[model samples]
Target: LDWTTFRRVFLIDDAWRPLMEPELANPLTAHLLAEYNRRCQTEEVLPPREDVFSWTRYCTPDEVRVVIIGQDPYHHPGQAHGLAFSVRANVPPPPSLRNVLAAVKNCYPEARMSGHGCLEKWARDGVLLLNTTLTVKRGAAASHSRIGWDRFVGGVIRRLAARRPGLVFMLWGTHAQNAIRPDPRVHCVLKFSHPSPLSKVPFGTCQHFLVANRYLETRSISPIDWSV
Candidate 1:
């Protein structure tokens, strides 16, 4: 089968079937399709396809040498257009991410031009992104409290990781880290303090890079080699 068909069967038959009841199929599909269309048209968020939740302009299956797993989608109605944990393009980034990105730019000003025009270089580098929740509730206090598809999300991670062994797994915070703890085949797990301005963790610490680099070397992988 072709890659598209393979992805459908891999996700629907092997992953979604067990969790989703046959009776709920039609409504669920309809709801998801409607949501996808709404986001695409209203928010100007173009996904990889009609079914999969993807956003951002620069991403592909082949270029991704790393995977970053996040807990849920953005809470704001127009913010998260199904690209895993990504916020909308025109909107201002979260404080934590903004702070980190600023620091990266300060250190390496030249690393400011590629992949979504410098602001979103990480996305363009083939980062296989996925979130536990693909949708957010209509009204929520914090964007982090958005609803998620736990079972399907886990299955997607497993399938992607299985296909790409030795890829770096950047697990932000405890929630993302713990989600994959049950699976032993997940080779390297690098924990990072969630880059939210509200976060208590220090930014750009040596310890964080130490942990990240250690994992890469253990897997016989090379580092990004940038100053940031």
Candidate 2:
């Protein structure tokens, strides 16, 4: 069997089987896999392909109440491990995450920061933390964008949009905003300036954490304990 078939069988899980499985079988994904191996020879990519499904390990499709779309995995090492903006324990927080952490702190005065700059707890609390481009060439931004990750993740956003009647979508920055499919089923869509220090937009103005929790509360779902 080809790696694609093998990946679907072993790499992917039961939670994503409904949507991702069928999508991976399509010709579009075929090109994704073709470029995957082709680039493998020339580029040092972060996050093994098998680990692309790591987001599911944190929150399954059903557990997902809020979908937070990030631009891409961090190109730096010790970061970009499937979950966007997350890093290994003990690693210092990146500038963008520092800004996000600051926002979260300001939004939830009772909350504290994660030493590892990791958001695994948030993910477990029904936050679908996803990145537009999953894999990337070493030390570059958008290096792997056109290879088909955009289509794949777009499909994911669309599928999730179709599932729940009122799922919250936190589309951060221009790239994530552009990826949105604008479904009526979405309970509320909140936009945040990318939490980057260099970004001309004001990240402090968007209290995304509070806004998301407010919407989640309307549905009677337990608001995420931002302190966690």
Best model number under TM-score:
2
lDDT of 2 at 50: 62
List runs of model 1 lying over 4 Å from the truth: 1-52, 55-62, 106-110, 113-121, 141-148, 182-186, 206-228
Candidate 1 lDDT tens digits, 1-228: 333353453243233332233323445444544554565455433223432443223554434566767666555555655555555566666665565555455555565322221224455565556666565444442332322256546655665566566666777777887787533355666677776666786554414334555666776766553331
| Backbone clashes, each candidate | 5, 0
The per-model lDDT (C-alpha) reads: 0.52, 0.77
- Candidate 2 C-alpha error for residue 126, in Å: 1.0
Model 1's TM-score against the true structure: 0.60
Worst 10 residues of 1 by lDDT: 112-121
